[PDB]
Amino acid sequence: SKRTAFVMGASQGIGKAIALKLADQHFSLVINSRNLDNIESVKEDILAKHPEASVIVLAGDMSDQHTRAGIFQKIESQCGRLDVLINNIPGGAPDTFDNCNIEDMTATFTQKTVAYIDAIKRASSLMKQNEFGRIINIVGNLWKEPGANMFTNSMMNAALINASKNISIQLAPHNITVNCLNPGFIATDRYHQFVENVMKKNQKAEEQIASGIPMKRVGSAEETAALAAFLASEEASYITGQQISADGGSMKSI
Amino acid sequence: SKRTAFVMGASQGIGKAIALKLADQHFSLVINSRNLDNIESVKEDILAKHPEASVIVLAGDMSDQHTRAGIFQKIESQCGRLDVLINNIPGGAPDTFDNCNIEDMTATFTQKTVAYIDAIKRASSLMKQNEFGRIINIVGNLWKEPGANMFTNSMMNAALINASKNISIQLAPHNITVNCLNPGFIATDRYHQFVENVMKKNQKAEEQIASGIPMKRVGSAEETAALAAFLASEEASYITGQQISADGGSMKSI
Numbered sequence: 370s371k372r373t374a375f376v377m378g379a380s381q382g383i384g385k386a387i388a389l390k391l392a393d394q395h396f397s398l399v400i401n402s403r404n405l406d407n408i409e410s411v412k413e414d415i416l417a418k419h420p421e422a423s424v425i426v427l428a429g430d431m432s433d434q435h436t437r438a439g440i441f442q443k444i445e446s447q448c449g450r451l452d453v454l455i456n457n458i459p460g461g462a463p464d465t466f467d468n469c470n471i472e473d474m475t476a477t478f479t480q481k482t483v484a485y486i487d488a489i490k491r492a493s494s495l496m497k498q499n500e501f502g503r504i505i506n507i508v509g510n511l512w513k514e515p516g517a518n519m520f521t522n523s524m525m526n527a528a529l530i531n532a533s534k535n536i537s538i539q540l541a542p543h544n545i546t547v548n549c550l551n552p553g554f555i556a557t558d559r560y561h562q563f564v565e566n567v568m569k570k571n572q573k574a575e576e577q578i579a580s581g582i583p584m585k586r587v588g589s590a591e592e593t594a595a596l597a598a599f600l601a602s603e604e605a606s607y608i609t610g611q612q613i614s615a616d617g618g619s620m621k622s623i
Numbered sequence: 624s625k626r627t628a629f630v631m632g633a634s635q636g637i638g639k640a641i642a643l644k645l646a647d648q649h650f651s652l653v654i655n656s657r658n659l660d661n662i663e664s665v666k667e668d669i670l671a672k673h674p675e676a677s678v679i680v681l682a683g684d685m686s687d688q689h690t691r692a693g694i695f696q697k698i699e700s701q702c703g704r705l706d707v708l709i710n711n712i713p714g715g716a717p718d719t720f721d722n723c724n725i726e727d728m729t730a731t732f733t734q735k736t737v738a739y740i741d742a743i744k745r746a747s748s749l750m751k752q753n754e755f756g757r758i759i760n761i762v763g764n765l766w767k768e769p770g771a772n773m774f775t776n777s778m779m780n781a782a783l784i785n786a787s788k789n790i791s792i793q794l795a796p797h798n799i800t801v802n803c804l805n806p807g808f809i810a811t812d813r814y815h816q817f818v819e820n821v822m823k824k825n826q827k828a829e830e831q832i833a834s835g836i837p838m839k840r841v842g843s844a845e846e847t848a849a850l851a852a853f854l855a856s857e858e859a860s861y862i863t864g865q866q867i868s869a870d871g872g873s874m875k876s877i
């Protein structure tokens with residue numbers, strides 16, 4: 370089967386690892402990030418490793434509603450189908466209960482949560498046409514346990530888990546699965562940030578972070594991509610509405 | 624103790640029942656709804672029953688940010704304190720995954736979820752001054768199990784549960800409790816609506832609704848107010864960050 374997968378925010382980190390892995394598994398790829406050079410560099414990496422691969426680059430801000438429509442129109446025109454969606458867009462600027470404001474909170478809501486929901490809407494239309502879809506929402510662990518320095522991102526994570534569940538029920542009769550993948554601590558540029566964004570006090574801030582992880586280490590982007598890829602496979606046909614963490618045991622709650 | 628309680632959306636339904644009950648328990652009351660005549664009628668009811676009561680009416684749209692600031696400035700000026708907040712504002716227009724749009728979803732987010740969070744921010748400032756607060760968020764059961772015809776309201780409920788938890792951790796050292804009260808099916812004008820808003824097919828639509836309730840009946844506004852009032856009492860000083868349903872057993876999930 371020649372399945373087609375759309376992976377956004379794929380120029381680095383979790384998105385890039387998912388792209389490389391889906392390529393290794395012979396998916397036709399549509400890939401996206403904002404920076405054109407950086408996402409092109411990924412298509413090169415894939416081609417270099419898989420010269421016979423099919424990879425289409427659609428750069429652009431996936432948080433922007435009109436861009437989203439445009440990227441999905443291009444997908445339908447140039448692909449004719451869509452089998453897999455990887456929803457992967459960063460949350461908003463960190464905020465707290467004390468400093469949150471309606472403007473920033475509104476922007477955070479629209480830029481991740483609304484974007485995912487809209488992307489699912491447009492992806493699912495294509496997916497229904499061939500009665501097959503796999504949707505993996507990259508969300509996060511703040512959804513169950515917030516979240517002091519991520520006040521709005523935590524509540525938006527909870528919203529997204531709740532919406533994905535709802536959507537999964539609606540899309541299930543069409544053989545479209547909808548699952549959430551919640552990374553814990555994964556070594557990307559966003560985590561290497563955190564190691565500093567907290568160093569605010571004193572590299573051995575990571576020994577501190579790793580302590581709270583039962584596995585006692587930060588996970589790799591590929592460890593996260595292994596889960597995404599399994600969820601995207603045809604054999605994961607009876608798994609939907611799930612929230613699955615790749616967090617080395619970090620969630621102490623069932 | 625002469626505690627002061629602010630109850631919004633108090634002109635009918637759950638809010639009105641909470642107001643009457645807090646009055647029976649000798650709280651000083653600030654009460655609000657949009658319709659001036661209707662909320663005044665409630666102050667009359669209270670006075671008629673408790674001639675020596677203290678009841679201040681502050682009409683206005685609590686979803687409106689500037690009104691909120693104004694109502695809270697009036698509370699600080701005319702009350703000098705605030706001990707109890709009852710967050711009680713309806714959700715947005717019902718929507719579905721299929722018909723949801725960024726405009727309406729944004730309005731729903733701002734009108735309930737942001738409003739509660741902002742109200743908590745302004746109420747907590749007053750509460751900190753006397754090291755006592757009780758905050759009861761009237762939310763809903765759609766937060767754990769959505770929610771087909773309430774797509775955005777369900778995810779906003781999940782957001783609110785997540786935010787309340789976060790806030791409860793922050794406000795706990797100040798002896799301010801923060802709990803969510805999730806009504807299931809409660810006989811108000813909003814439910815009597817639903818009995819029709821679903822009659823779309825065929826009063827015996829209620830026999831249908833009641834079937835899904837283990838107690839086999841819809842609850843009363845006073846049954847809901849009994850829980851709110853207990854949470855608002857001084858003796859509930861060690862209960863915070865809770866989500867408690869008054870739903871006749873309707874939640875089948877733990």
Ligand SMILES: NC(=O)C1=CN([C@@H]2O[C@H](COP(=O)(O)OP(=O)(O)OC[C@H]3O[C@@H](n4cnc5c(N)ncnc54)[C@H](OP(=O)(O)O)[C@@H]3O)[C@@H](O)[C@H]2O)C=CC1
Pocket residue numbers: 377378379380381382383384401402403404405407408429430431432457458459460507508509510551552553554555556557558559560
């Ligand atoms: N510990 C962790 O890594 C955790 C990660 N997550 C979540 O996992 C997801 C990915 O995380 P992570 O790998 O660390 O992210 P990264 O910051 O490492 O990279 C994000 C990628 O997305 C691209 N991107 C950013 N904004 C947009 C946009 N508006 N439209 C399209 N592409 C965009 C970036 O490229 P470019 O700038 O070129 O657009 C970049 O390639 C995020 O949603 C994050 O919230 C959740 C919890 C923990």
Ligand SMILES: NC(=O)C1=CN([C@@H]2O[C@H](COP(=O)(O)OP(=O)(O)OC[C@H]3O[C@@H](n4cnc5c(N)ncnc54)[C@H](OP(=O)(O)O)[C@@H]3O)[C@@H](O)[C@H]2O)C=CC1
Pocket residue numbers: 631632633634635636637638655656657658659661662683684685686711712713714761762763764805806807808809810811812813814
């Ligand atoms: N089965 C049920 O009743 C359920 C209820 N809930 C929740 O419980 C809460 C109360 O429900 P319910 O009693 O049925 O609501 P009602 O529709 O019966 O009444 C709501 C009250 O709030 C007032 N109000 C509405 N909008 C505003 C506003 N923007 N600012 C200030 N006041 C307002 C209304 O008066 P006025 O128009 O004069 O302003 C009215 O008095 C809601 O948040 C609802 O979401 C959740 C699940 C189930």
